Nucleic acid binder design. Structure first.
Ligand SMILES: Nc1nc2c(ncn2[C@@H]2O[C@H](COP(=O)(O)OP(=O)(O)CP(=O)(O)O)[C@@H](O)[C@H]2O)c(=O)[nH]1
Ligand code: MET
Ligand SMILES: [Mg+2]
Ligand SMILES: [Mg+2]
Lengths: 95, 48, 470, 134
RNA sequence: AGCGCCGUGGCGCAGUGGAAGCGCGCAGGGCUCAUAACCCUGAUGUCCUCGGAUCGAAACCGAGCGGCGCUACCA
């Protein structure tokens, strides 16, 4: 049972609103924005991202319009984070 | 010569994977907009 | 622990009740405000005009309380073709102690002669100022004929303008102009939406309303802020109805006539035929007083085409079986009020759209059907009811020979063809017959943008008559 | 002369202020609960009570815009299907636009009632006569 | 308002007269390297409500309810 990862100073939690083609996604960041994210390396074709699943995405200082996914939460670290309260708790996502 | 408008990071091709750091520049001579890549490790934060 | 109905019945018996009309009263001494006339009939016709989808049946239902039905599946919501009706009795308090603005109170036709004052702390009883009829008119662009027919029937007018929407709505202007055509110079203005508007937005709307009504024939029309749904400021409207509209000159000297506008068949389904009723012509009587047991004929009547294609008119003779007005069966009917003449006319002759816009004459007179009617016409400079997106208003073009125009002679809905056009005169040949009695106020409209658009006015001065076959 | 007009306007404004000194931003945040091939709307009772509409009619409209069927448990709606909160939010907004919100006046007091057999929703804040059934 | 209908297992149809029906659904396992297609097997219903005839009614019918298509708002 691998430990979860918390957020650090520019890497923030988000939810896939719906996944884009050609290796992109649209992530509603839990800041109020419907940002566009790129599926990074280390994560492209080994950990499949499903529409509607809480994830971690790194912002870029020099583009706030687009960001890149980093780590994925398999709805278990996600529910535990919602219990702890790392995200605005109005947008509750669960199975 | 040109003037920097915004700082776009352009996504790499297939066999590689990186976010190559670049910049939109409007050329002073005519005004056409061109994307230019900026070669070095810690060079982007020098573009200003 | 008395039931509400028992209380209402006791208040009705204490309030004077509903008297029964004398079977033979002295007629030359009958004024439109007499008790035999006022407590049971509506003597002044009051209409409502406005743009589509703002609420006119709403205002009338708030005022009187008699619903306009709004029938026919699709027509429960979108638009109606027939006019809406409602009887309103205007009551004012006798007590000078209660302030005048809330003294007036409009009630249903079933109300007593003197209902109590519902204002708290006021023991005085109400007095019936006048009984009025309400002619609701569907304000749509597609529907032109019934608006003009009712406006002919009308005697005073109420224009409705919405608050939040655009100020110079063209349908309101068209209806006001049509009212000005048919000799109606008594209109009161109502701002339907004020609750959703600000104190300065309402003032700007009022300034726009005043700016609109400067070049119109009606000049000093009172303006009233009213609420259709909130059910407030009706007593003041009753006051304005009383003050700014007097009784049009109408006595019993004029010869009897009638104008059917709607046609009602009394055939209740499910009941056996051995117990039936006669066919009803819903008519406005602007002249003539009708009694029980009077023989009367529909002049344009049966319209037929011979084998050669010629037009024959068989007048529809009829014995008056009943004259239903307001709420109760009444002996005499006051001219200038919508009344159902239930005669022994065939029920199928009155199914839905058969007796609409048809003149009728009591025995002792012979109105004439015309095939050719030569008219004195006049036009305006720009059309009304058309929204031009920032350009000049559509300018009326002169008449062309051999053209179909909707000519509404009073109520009669006819589509005429032009034989010739002159400087002030024109000649029209009609397909559907129309009869003329004295002059009849006529409205003209043409087909340019799909549907009918009003153009001006006209009056018949001569024509070719067809002697009816008896 | 418009002098006998603005006076009644002032009286009407005074009556409006006295009767309704308050004179919707109360739509619940839609919690779409997606269990794989299953969908759960557990807050449906809260939306139904915060828009003054019975849950039966809301569920019927849901199964009219969405071509599926579902079960009600306890307050909660379970529909075995994969669907986004985007479309749920859009359908809720459209329902509010044509059912919860009155078209003639900006109000929520209106409720579903019946006048011969057609469904006639009627207003309470003003008392209008509208119909939204299809 | 009357007429022509209907009343479901989650949805759709069906016989109405011997009395819980089938597909679409969904759960489960089966084929498959694997998914879909396809196999097979389940747990759920006042066949709307009150009655009357019947050895028997969900069914034949009436006296009523709700939803409808017309006729047509039928003073
Ligand atoms: N907010 C508000 N709504 C009103 C007001 N008056 C009427 N309405 C509403 O506007 C809508 C139109 O009502 P309606 O009487 O049917 O309009 P109509 O005159 O019959 C249509 P037409 O003009 O073609 O004849 C109704 O929903 C009514 O309740 C009002 O004063 N304020
Ligand atoms: C004036 S009552 C309405 C018209 C006709 N008497 C019917 O009834
Ligand atoms: Mg990449
Ligand atoms: Mg009407």
């Amino acid at each position: 049972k691998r430990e979860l990862i918390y957020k650090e100073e520019g890497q923030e939690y988000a939810q896939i609103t719906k996944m884009l083609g050609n290796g992109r996604v649209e992530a509603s960041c839990f800041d109020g924005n419907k940002r566009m994210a790129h599926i990074r390396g280390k994560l492209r074709k080994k950990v499949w991202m499903g529409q509607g699943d809480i994830i971690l995405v790194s912002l870029r200082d020099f583009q706030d319009d687009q960001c890149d996914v980093v780590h994925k939460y398999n709805l278990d670290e996600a529910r535990t984070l919602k219990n702890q309260g790392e995200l605005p708790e109005n947008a509750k996502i669960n199975e | 010569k040109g003037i920097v408008l915004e700082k776009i990071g352009i996504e790499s091709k297939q066999p590689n994977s990186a976010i190559r750091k670049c910049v939109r520049v409007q050329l002073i001579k005519n005004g056409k907009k061109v994307t230019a890549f900026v070669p070095n490790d810690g060079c982007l934060n020098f573009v200003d | 622990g008395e039931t509400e109905e028992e209380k209402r019945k006791r208040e009705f018996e204490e309030g004077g009740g509903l008297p029964e009309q004398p079977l033979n009263p002295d007629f030359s001494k009958l004024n439109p405000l007499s008790a035999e006339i006022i407590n049971r009939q509506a003597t002044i016709n009051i209409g409502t005009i406005g743009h589509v989808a703002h609420g006119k049946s709403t205002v009338v239902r708030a005022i009187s309380g008699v619903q306009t039905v709004r029938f026919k599946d699709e027509l429960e919501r979108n638009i109606t073709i027939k006019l809406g009706y409602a009887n309103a009795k205007i009551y004012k308090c006798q007590e000078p102690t209660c302030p005048e603005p809330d003294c007036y109170r409009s009630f249903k036709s079933d109300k007593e002669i003197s209902p109590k004052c519902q204002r708290p702390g006021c023991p005085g009883r109400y007095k019936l100022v006048r009984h009025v009829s309400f002619v609701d008119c569907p304000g749509h662009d597609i529907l032109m004929s019934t608006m003009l027919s009712g406006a002919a029937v009308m005697d005073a007018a109420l224009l409705l303008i919405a608050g939040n929407e655009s100020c110079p709505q063209p349908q309101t202007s068209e209806h006001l102009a049509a009212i000005e055509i048919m000799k109606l110079k008594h209109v009161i203005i109502l701002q339907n939406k004020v609750d959703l508007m600000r104190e300065e937005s309402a003032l700007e709307h009022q300034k726009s309303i005043l700016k609109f009504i400067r070049g119109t024939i009606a000049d000093g029309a009172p303006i009233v802020p009213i609420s259709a749904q909130l059910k407030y400021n009706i007593d003041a409207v009753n006051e304005f109805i009383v003050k700014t509209i007097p009784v049009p000159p109408r006595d019993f000297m004029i010869s009897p006539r009638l104008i059917v506008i709607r046609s009602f068949d009394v055939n209740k389904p499910g009941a056996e035929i051995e117990d039936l009723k006669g066919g009803v012509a819903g008519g406005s009587i602007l002249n003539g007083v009708f009694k029980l047991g009077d023989e009367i004929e529909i002049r344009p009547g049966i319209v037929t085409k011979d084998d050669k294609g010629k037009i024959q008119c068989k007048p529809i003779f009829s014995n008056i079986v009943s004259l239903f007005a307001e709420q109760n069966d009444l002996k005499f009917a006051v001219p200038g009020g919508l009344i159902g003449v239930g005669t022994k006319v065939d029920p199928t002759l009155c199914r839905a759209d058969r007796l609409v816009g048809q003149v009728v004459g009591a025995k002792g007179h012979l109105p004439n059907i015309y095939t050719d009617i030569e008219i004195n016409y006049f036009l305006l400079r720009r059309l009304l009811g058309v929204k031009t997106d920032g350009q000049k208003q559509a300018k009326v073009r002169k008449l062309e020979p051999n053209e179909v125009l909707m000519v509404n002679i009073g109520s009669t809905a006819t589509g005429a063809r032009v034989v010739a056009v002159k400087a002030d005169m024109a000649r029209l040949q009609l397909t559907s017959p129309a009869c003329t009695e004295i002059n009849e106020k006529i409205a003209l409209s043409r087909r340019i943008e799909k549907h009918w658009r009003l153009i001006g006015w006209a009056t018949i001065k001569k024509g070719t008559t067809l002697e009816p076959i008896a | 002369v418009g002098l006998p007009y603005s006076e009644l306007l002032s009286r009407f404004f005074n009556i409006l202020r006295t009767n309704n000194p308050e004179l919707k931003f109360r739509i619940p945040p839609p919690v779409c609960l997606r269990d794989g091939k299953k969908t759960i709307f557990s807050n449906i009772q809260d939306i139904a009570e915060k828009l003054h509409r019975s849950p039966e009619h809301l569920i019927q409209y849901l199964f009219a815009e969405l071509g599926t069927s579902g079960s009600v448990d306890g307050k909660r709606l379970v529909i075995k299907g994969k669907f986004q909160s985007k479309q749920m939010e859009n359908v809720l907004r459209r329902y509010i636009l044509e059912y919860v919100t009155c078209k003639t006046c900006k109000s929520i007091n209106t409720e579903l009632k019946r006048e011969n057999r057609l469904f006639f929703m009627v207003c309470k804040s003003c008392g209008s006569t509208r119909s939204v059934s299809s």
